[PDB]
């Protein structure tokens, strides 16, 4: 469904996956919510990333262990275990950036994105062309 240029990371440490739609932070709070944060100062804005198969990641949260989700509805969530919602298709966008893309709802194209108000996009609501998608994986 997607094409496949990989981002040059790796995923030994942990990162700080910035939008830059509006300069969030994306956040999964102990609660399970997920939104974004300007406050760099944040305990749940680490994330540690990792791979599955080439391509293939999760989000993991280092301060609470949930994994970033995206449930049937096109939200997202912190899930307290890894399930198939977990998985996102990481690639390189404009020569630049990184993308995820929720590897359950590939064929529609459903991304992880942050609106510039701080708050999530809804799956259905992404698309290919958005500033919201657009990530920077940014050392903590």
């Known amino acids: 469904h997607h094409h496949f240029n990989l981002p040059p990371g790796n995923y030994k440490k942990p990162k700080l996956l910035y939008c830059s739609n509006g300069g969030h932070f994306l956040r999964i709070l102990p609660d399970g919510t997920v939104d ?22 999760y989000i993991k949260s280092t301060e609470t262990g949930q994994y970033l989700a995206m449930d049937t509805d096109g939200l997202l969530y912190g899930s307290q275990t890894p399930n198939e919602e977990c998985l ?8 630049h950036y990184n993308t995820y893309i929720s590897k359950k709802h590939a064929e529609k194209n459903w991304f992880v994105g942050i609106k510039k108000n701080g708050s999530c996009k809804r799956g259905p609501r992404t698309h290919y062309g958005q500033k919201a998608i657009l990530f920077l994986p940014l050392p903590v």
């Open 88 to 95: 996102f298709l990481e690639r390189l966008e404009e020569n």
């Open 36 to 57: 974004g944060t300007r406050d760099r100062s944040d305990q749940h804005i680490q994330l540690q990333l990792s791979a599955e198969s080439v391509g293939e990641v």
